[PDB]
Each structure stands twice: as C-alpha cells, then as structure tokens.
Amino acid sequence: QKFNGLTVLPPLLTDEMIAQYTSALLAGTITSG
Amino acid sequence: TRFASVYAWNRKRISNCVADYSVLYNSASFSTFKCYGVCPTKLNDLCFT
Amino acid sequence: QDSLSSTPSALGKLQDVVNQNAQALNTLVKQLSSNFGAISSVLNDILSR
Amino acid sequence: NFNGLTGTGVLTESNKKFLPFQQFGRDIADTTDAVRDPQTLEILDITPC
Numbered sequence: 001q002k003f004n005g006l007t008v009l010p011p012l013l014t015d016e017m018i019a020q021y022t023s024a025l026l027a028g029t030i031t032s033g
Numbered sequence: 034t035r036f037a038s039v040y041a042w043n044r045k046r047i048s049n050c051v052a053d054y055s056v057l058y059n060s061a062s063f064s065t066f067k068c069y070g071v072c073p074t075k076l077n078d079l080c081f082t
Numbered sequence: 083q084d085s086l087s088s089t090p091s092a093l094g095k096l097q098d099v100v101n102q103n104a105q106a107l108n109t110l111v112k113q114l115s116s117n118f119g120a121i122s123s124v125l126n127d128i129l130s131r
Numbered sequence: 132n133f134n135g136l137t138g139t140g141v142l143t144e145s146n147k148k149f150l151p152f153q154q155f156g157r158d159i160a161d162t163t164d165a166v167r168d169p170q171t172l173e174i175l176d177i178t179p180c
C-alpha cells in the first residue's frame with residue numbers, strides 16, 4: 001500500500017493514554033460512586 | 034537478391050544481436066513504414082525477446 | 083476473563099472493522115493492475131513504447 | 132533502465148531465490164519489485180525512493 005501513495009496516520013491518543021482514561025473512570029466509580 | 038512469394042512468405046528469425054533501427058527509419062528508400070504498438074523513434078532503445 | 087480467553091469469536095465486532103478496512107485498501111491497490119482498455123496497466127510501458 | 136524496463140528507486144542485493152528462467156518479480160500492483168541484472172545475473176530488490 002505504502003508505495004502507491006497510500007498511508008496510515010497514527011491516532012492522537014495512544015493506547016497508554018486510553019488505558020489511563022479507563023483507569024481514572026474505574027477509580028472514580030469505585031471510590032466515589 | 035531474392036524474396037519469397039506471398040503465398041509462401043518467408044520467416045527470418047532475428048536474435049542474439051544488437052539492433053539498429055535508425056538505419057531503417059531514417060532511410061528514404063521506404064515508401065511505407067507503419068508501426069503499431071510502438072513509435073519508430075523509441076524503437077531504438079527497447080529490447081525484445 | 084475465562085469466557086473471552088476461550089472464545090475466538092468474542093471480539094468479532096472489532097475484528098470486522100479491521101477486516102473491512104483492510105479489504106478496501108487491498109482492493110484499491112489491486113485496481114492498479116487493471117488496463118481499463120489501455121495496452122498496459124503500467125504507465126512506464128506506455129511512455130517508453 | 133534494465134533491458135528496456137524504466138523506473139526510479141533504490142537498488143539493493145536481493146535474497147530472493149530466482150529460478151534461471153526468471154528475470155523479474157512483480158507485486159500485487161503489477162509493479163516490478165525485483166530484477167536480474169542482465170550482465171552479472173545478480174538479483175536486485177527495487178524499492179521506491
């Protein structure tokens with residue numbers, strides 16, 4: 001694909017960043033309902 | 034010196050050689066010089082099997 | 083945890099998105115092999131001949 | 132320009148095991164991605180710049 005003008009762009013948020021958001025949501029739910 | 038008839042036309046195989054088509058294309062001796070699928074001026078830098 | 087570990091199709095919905103996008107790109111590239119009525123799919127062949 | 136085959140890219144030595152009758156390889160886009168050098172018989176990989 002690459003060599004025919006077709007490319008792929010990276011996400012703005014990384015998998016680590018997404019995991020961090022998820023952790024924050026879980027931490028909130030558990031400690032503060 | 035001698036050519037073949039049209040009913041029993043002669044096939045000469047040309048191979049294993051370096052061609053030069055500028056001697057033919059730039060010759061005024063030919064009344065007809067019609068190429069199909071290839072341009073006479075580009076024929077001088079192509080290869081064939 | 084066990085259900086997901088032992089069920090290959092559990093995440094089919096996410097895999098389907100990946101597969102559909104891959105299918106579209108592969109199709110797009112393969113179309114470069116089509117002549118579309120031209121003598122050759124390769125542009126360089128046309129220009130050189 | 133390899134035996135009439137024109138293009139642009141980076142040439143490197145290939146590890147592809149060509150058979151004696153094969154001069155080039157092709158990709159799914161119908162582009163050439165490897166050639167045999169007409170004089171050294173070395174197989175070269177072709178990768179766009």
Ligand SMILES: *[C@@H]1O[C@H](CO)[C@@H](O)[C@H](O)[C@H]1NC(C)=O
Nearest residue numbers: 151167168169170171172173
């Ligand atoms: C000429 O080409 C042949 C392959 O077709 C190769 O084996 C030979 O070494 C070449 N000769 C020279 C002087 O490169």
